[PDB]
Structures are given as structure tokens and as C-alpha cells.
Design an enzyme around this catalytic site. Sequence first.
Site, PDB file in Angstrom:
ATOM      1  N   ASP A 180       0.674  -1.268   0.575  1.00 48.12           N
ATOM      2  CA  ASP A 180       0.247  -0.009   0.266  1.00 48.12           C
ATOM      3  C   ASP A 180       0.881   1.052   0.074  1.00 48.12           C
ATOM      4  OD1 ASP A 180       0.810   0.012   2.645  1.00 48.12           O
ATOM      5  OD2 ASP A 180      -0.808   1.046   3.494  1.00 48.12           O
ATOM      6  N   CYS A 214      -8.012  -3.494  -3.509  1.00 47.03           N
ATOM      7  CA  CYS A 214      -7.017  -3.037  -2.032  1.00 47.03           C
ATOM      8  C   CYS A 214      -7.468  -3.426  -1.403  1.00 47.03           C
ATOM      9  CB  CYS A 214      -5.827  -2.201  -2.522  1.00 47.03           C
ATOM     10  SG  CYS A 214      -6.646  -0.219  -3.553  1.00 47.03           S
ATOM     11  N   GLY A 217      -9.107   0.574  -1.753  1.00 46.74           N
ATOM     12  CA  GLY A 217      -9.775   0.675  -3.703  1.00 46.74           C
ATOM     13  C   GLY A 217     -10.153   2.176  -4.547  1.00 46.74           C
ATOM     14  N   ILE A 218      -8.361   2.548  -4.070  1.00 52.43           N
ATOM     15  CA  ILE A 218      -8.494   3.811  -4.884  1.00 52.43           C
ATOM     16  C   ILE A 218      -6.598   4.184  -5.090  1.00 52.43           C
ATOM     17  CG2 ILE A 218      -9.964   5.072  -3.703  1.00 52.43           C
ATOM     18  CD1 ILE A 218      -8.138   6.653  -2.134  1.00 52.43           C
ATOM     19  N   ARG A 220      -3.575   0.918  -5.446  1.00 50.98           N
ATOM     20  CA  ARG A 220      -3.263   0.694  -5.742  1.00 50.98           C
ATOM     21  C   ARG A 220      -4.102  -0.399  -6.920  1.00 50.98           C
ATOM     22  NH1 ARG A 220      -1.464  -3.418  -1.149  1.00 50.98           N
ATOM     23  NH2 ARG A 220      -3.325  -1.922  -0.638  1.00 50.98           N
ATOM     24  N   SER A 221      -5.779   0.312  -6.645  1.00 52.98           N
ATOM     25  CA  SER A 221      -6.794  -0.686  -7.818  1.00 52.98           C
ATOM     26  C   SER A 221      -7.398   1.178  -8.944  1.00 52.98           C
ATOM     27  CB  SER A 221      -7.700  -0.018  -6.767  1.00 52.98           C
ATOM     28  OG  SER A 221      -8.720  -1.303  -5.563  1.00 52.98           O
ATOM     29  N   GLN A 261      -2.662   6.753  -5.550  1.00 50.23           N
ATOM     30  CA  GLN A 261      -2.476   7.989  -3.817  1.00 50.23           C
ATOM     31  C   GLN A 261      -0.973   8.919  -3.596  1.00 50.23           C
ATOM     32  OE1 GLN A 261      -4.071   3.995  -1.653  1.00 50.23           O
ATOM     33  NE2 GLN A 261      -4.736   6.002  -0.497  1.00 50.23           N
TER      34      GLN A 261
END
EC number: 3.1.3.48
Length: 297
Positions: A180, A214, A217-218, A220-221, A261
Site C-alpha cells: 500500500d 485493495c 480501493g483507490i 493500487r486499484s 494515492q
Amino acid sequence: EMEKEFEQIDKSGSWAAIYQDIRHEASDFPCRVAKLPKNKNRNRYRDVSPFDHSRIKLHQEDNDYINASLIKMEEAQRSYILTQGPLPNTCGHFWEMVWEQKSRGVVMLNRVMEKGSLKCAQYWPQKEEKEMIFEDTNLKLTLISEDIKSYYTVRQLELENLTTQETREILHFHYTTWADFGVPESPASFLNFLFKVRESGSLSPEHGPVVVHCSAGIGRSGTFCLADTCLLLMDKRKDPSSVDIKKVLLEMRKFRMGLIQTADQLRFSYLAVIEGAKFIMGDSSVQDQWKELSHED
């Protein structure tokens, strides 16, 4: 050219400023349903919510809320569902969503345990003989087989609607080495994985949207979806120069907040798209080279 701009940004050392510009320009839409008191225990992170306009609705009378967003890329003609790592009380909702949306694949980019903390419930069975039943949504889930590689695992699952006894095969693509707020080991490793998802048929228009998650959900996704959409766009007219990565990311951010991110994830996204362009533009052998460089066993 994304490559000419990539070199410019690198020389300037301006990835952080570019990335903050995207943050400042990104869409801001209401998340009123996500913030209702009755949905507090359905959200993993206070600050990551689905917009109301793009949220996935569960087909149930009681509470239709799940923290999940439909990213509908009109020009590329691909859709993705981005969602958080399921919570212990939302695993039934997660598989209900997979059933109702007719998804064929689930892409999981995190581990259950990351940095000494639980990032995601164990929402699929780890052993063939120990299947899972989600009583709240009347679904049964069985592990059929598993193909374990060095940095990713592919699982074949059987999802059964117990109300009708209809069964479906679900493919689970589990990237196990992507931290992450981190980036994959190489463009080659990431692209090898992406092309494995592509090759399975899970991204194809005869199925529902692939589910990508992930922890939140922002991040890696977002990286996964951005690279995929960018490569698809380039594919449609064989024109790498027509693809504006930053504008594609901003378009995606109309459907879910916070996609990608960190500035280095943005930078990695450029690298992955630039390298993947070799395959799109006719050098099929590069796919073999990715698989070797990835050392998947």
C-alpha cells in the site's frame, strides 16, 4: 508524447507538483448515502467513500449500500468496479455485488495482513474442503483450484446463488507483493499480471465489470485501472500520442475519489503504459520478456 512529457517531468523533478495538480483539479461529488449513520460499519475508511452518482447498489430491500464505485470509461468502452477490502460484516454484500453485477473476475491487489494490520477480511475460502456460506445474502463460495506464482496467485472459485442453485465460475487474481502506497517491482511484473487478467476473459464486454480492490480501493486499484484503460485507448487507433494519461486519470476520478494515492504511483503508471505500448504497437514478443523478467516461476 507521454514519453517526451515523462522525461520533462523527471528532469524537472516535478512529479509531486504534477500529482498535486491532479488532486486540486479532481471532481468533488456528494457521498450522502455513504455517510448515513446506518452505513458507518459498512465503510473501512472514514475518508474513502463512493460518490452517490456512481455507487453500486445492492439488489436488496433492506440496505442497498456497499462501498463500491462503477468506473465507466465511455471512450475506452471498459468498465471496472472499484471497492474497498471487504469488512467482516460486508463479505456477503461483496459477493452479492459480484453476483448481481455478473462479474467474472476479482482483482485483489493487497494482502489480508499488511504492515502488521488487517487490511481486508478473509472473504474467500483458502481450502477446497472448507467452503463459505454467506447467510445474509444466500450465497455459497467454494475454492475449486489455485495456481500460486512468486508474486501473484490465480484462483478458480465457484459462486452459487443458493436461492436458485445457479452457479458461476469466478477467477480471483491476487497480487501479493504490492505494498500500500507503494509501486510494483517493475513495469514488467505489473504488465505480466495485467495481461494475465486480460487473457482470462475477465475484462471482456460479454461479462459484468471486473471487481478491483485493495484495502481502500483507490491507490493500487487506481494504478491498475489507469494503465489498463490507457493501453486499451492506444489499442483502438494504434496511436500512442492520442493518449493523455493525466486526463484519463481525471476522467476516472469523476467516478471514484482519490484514485492513485502517491506521485510515484502516477510516475509508475506512465512507466507501465510506455512499456505496454511496445505490445500494443506490434511487438508481441515483449509479453514473453515480461514473463521472464517477472520471475513468476
